[model samples]
Target: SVKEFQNLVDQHITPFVALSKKLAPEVGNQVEQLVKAIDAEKALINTASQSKKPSQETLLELIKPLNNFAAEVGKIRDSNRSSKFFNNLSAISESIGFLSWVVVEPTPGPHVAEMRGSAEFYTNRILKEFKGVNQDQVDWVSNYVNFLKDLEKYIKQYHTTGLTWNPKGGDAKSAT
Candidate 1:
């Protein structure tokens, strides 16, 4: 639809918006800032929304700002301040989702078993000592925590025998 632009953003960024407040401090702060960066462009988004669908003419104008905004989010992902969060399974999967939204790429990480181990390391975690929060914050926190738990389960489907995604479906009968 015309909201292809919006849908794409929501698909990638809204999920993180869902994560922003639930996790705290480093992750939460970074997410909040990231959200502000995108949210700051409300007028641009609204202008784009006028069409209700992306158009060749309209999209020409949209591409520049959208590309910049995407990069801005990626920059935060690239930062050391949020290092733990980005490398984290939840964040890792989220990044994969956004990067692959327009094209499916094999998800990144170490050996599948290694990835599994790291995922296990963070399992059953809880957020604590929230600074100041409201209903939106509380709701986002709940959804974020729940999403991570499910993503970990989804990620566990990878084999511990240690093989990559095998994009071509090659002969891997011997893979462990």
Candidate 2:
């Protein structure tokens, strides 16, 4: 299970793994950039989490990329949503979705600041792209929505425990 999620280290980068992989280096780089945005937010959460606290600073930093990661993933899917690349990219989003659940404050103090961006829009877009295309693609993206459901589940779980966090996610829960 850990191996499956760990594979995301490569899954997220895909064609960008090497500059000479037929596509331009930049093509692969965007996913790498998305990973950067993913982990940077993780780093902040790590600091606050280790201290047995959740900080708004980290939460704020996180939502920015939560929105950004969604955008980047959407773009990646846009480039290849209904094709072979869709499955590969789902691996990446699957992991990102898990990470996002880690910092979702279930019941924040009053004045929940509105998020400026949302990746959900693009996630919906990806699902829309698969219409009448192929069953497997629909099936896997069907799994994608399930993955998001799990993401929401984990977030709700966090609201109660404040514990199901693995910053780098090398532990058992990463697969969960």
Candidate 3:
């Protein structure tokens, strides 16, 4: 049984390993940008926490591109090829957009407030939608949702996890 599993890995996994080695770096770079954006927002939060002035310009600079990316993702998701995966990915993108707005837009007061509501809204709403779908559709959606989840987790751990780095040193990550 163990040998059969090993054979499966040898036959199937090697290519996946190779592809991941190739495409993962690009995804990592995107996540690094996201973390940097979060760090910038955190800095604003700290400033607000200290009862100091927040930098509107800096916050906008960090959020604008993220907003654009989310918008693009939304547009792509609205296309004919829409699937559960695209929906989940779009939800994540929308969450990022919400984060951007919560950080950049002026709200009730001068102090920066938490944006957990927006994040929860996206996550919960998507899960609720998935719960209402049929089994086949749910499976399709699960594939995309799971893929995005794994992508996010893997990207977050790229450096410490020792995920396979590609030999060519460019475009190192697999899609599937």
Candidate 4:
């Protein structure tokens, strides 16, 4: 009787396991892409420091993909197809938050500063509009926002601030 029951369980369970194995790679790929998008945004910010006039257009190019990836992850989470979905969405949200800081915090020029404010404006708008959705999802966004704030504080303290060139030859600190 025991042998018969064991054979029946294997017959029913084996196919499901095989199917899950096949789908695992697809899920893993999506997660990897989300991470790559985050890295690209960080690279953009790091480059901004070195640029005499960082192109807002270029910054948008970097930010667009990350934003889109975050949205996609949100959709996946809503679908609730797999347990991994929420985890992936959380990672993407964190990436967006990091990028948000890079764009919003002061850079070096008047135009850059203005652009940074604009970016923050848009980000705030999105956050406001998205209010009152699923609590869990909103929680993810809120967590990301807080993460960005904390990260900005950390960067400010660790990074050097001193007199340096401002667009043209003049004294400006990293604070500006």
Candidate 5:
């Protein structure tokens, strides 16, 4: 299980790190901020994985750092309005979305809510762009659609159960 989670970390860390580094290379300010957020995330992930703590808590810390990462990404994308950059970052966004989804518990917290909001907004915006458009290159569009659907499904379930999920402790919980 830890190995699988570690693999997830490996799966994401490199590209994201490179993306942040390669982004805005001419500008130092935004790049520095973005890199800081990403580095914090990577550090936490590596440390947490090595500590061998419960995945949930590690994921909880990760959620915060990840939120910071996305926040910085938004700042850069908004300021630059670079469609090309945004397109490249979409993969990172989706990966971050998946991580957020995985980290969320039935008993959601502030970090969970924050992460969910960003992921939902980004996914919805991207889905809108593809609506009613016919693309010739279409092998992976299904994969894109599929991932969005899966995320939507998870968010739906999160809200549904979160409404009634008690978190009073193992022996002290119920719903009406």
Candidate 6:
């Protein structure tokens, strides 16, 4: 159900808005695009959730905003690749990669598994980079990455089939 799908957004991606808001001033104005994309996607998901009978077209539409957010992050990463300004930006891209996989079908196809693997690799890289920062923003960013990882697990168990969610479990357990 869209509720289950939206729950994934709420439980995982929503925290990103606060993280971006906190880090935007430290970074630059480009973050506005990322935040805007997040809001757009959230609104889209919410709307779909409220529909009496959401269509495949509506479900597929969820990918657009996520794709936009990923593109914006890619632009920012490429523009400032040599700087520390957006150290965790790559994590967001990988997170989006995994999200797109689930949104596209919510099925664990070979391609979906591939995307989850990419998310894991990139999330781990950022988590390792921020390991000893002893800073709040770094901690927040680490937590956000872990949330995305949890969403991956959520999809694996709940969305074992395409669009036919199981409703058999709670939120995915911690990656511990």
Report backbone clashes per prediction: 4, 1, 9, 0, 0, 0
Model 6 ranges off by over 4 Å:
1-16, 23-62, 102-113, 156-158, 164-176
Better-scoring candidate (TM-score), 1 or 6: 6
Which digits, one per residue and each the tens of the lDDT, describe model 3 over residues 1-176?
22332343344334333432243333223333444444443343333333323245654563464465455544544552334344334333444443343343233111111223333445455467656664433443343334333333332332122212234332211121
Candidate with top TM-score is: 6
User: Candidate 4 at 148: error in angstroms?
Assistant: 6.5
Q: Give me the displacement of residue 170 in model 5, in angstroms.
A: 15
lDDT of 5: 0.42
> Ten-residue segment with the worst summed lDDT in candidate 5?
166-175
Provide the overall lDDT of each model, using Cα atoms, as 2-decimal numbers.
Answer: 0.40, 0.43, 0.37, 0.42, 0.42, 0.53
Best by lDDT: 6
lDDT of 4 by residue, 39-97 (tens): 55444444444444345675566467667766664555455555543443333333433
Ranking by TM-score: 6, 4, 2, 5, 1, 3
Taking all chains together, each candidate's TM-score versus the true structure is: 0.34, 0.39, 0.32, 0.39, 0.35, 0.58
Model 3 residue 115 CA deviation in Å: 8.2
Q: How should the candidates be ordered by lDDT, best one leading?
A: 6, 2, 5, 4, 1, 3
Against the hidden true structure, what lDDT does model 2 obtain? 0.43
Show model 1 residue runs off by greater than 4 Å.
1-25, 37-45, 52-57, 88-176
Taking all chains together, the TM-score of candidate 6 against the true structure is 0.58
True-vs-predicted CA distance for residue 84, candidate 3, Å: 4.5
Stretches of candidate 2 off by over 4 Å are 1-27, 50-58, 105-160, 163-176
User: Is 1 or 6 the stronger prediction by lDDT?
Assistant: 6
lDDT of 2 by residue, 2-98 (tens): 2332343334333234421232333344456555664554554444444434356755554675567666755665566545454445444444444
Select the stronger candidate by lDDT from 2 and 5.
2
What shift in Å separates residue 115 of candidate 4 from its native position after superposition?
A: 21
For residues 44-163, write the lDDT of model 5, one tens digit per residue.
Answer: 434433443344554455457667766765565556555544533443343344334334455333434454455445545544565466231121233333433443443454333321
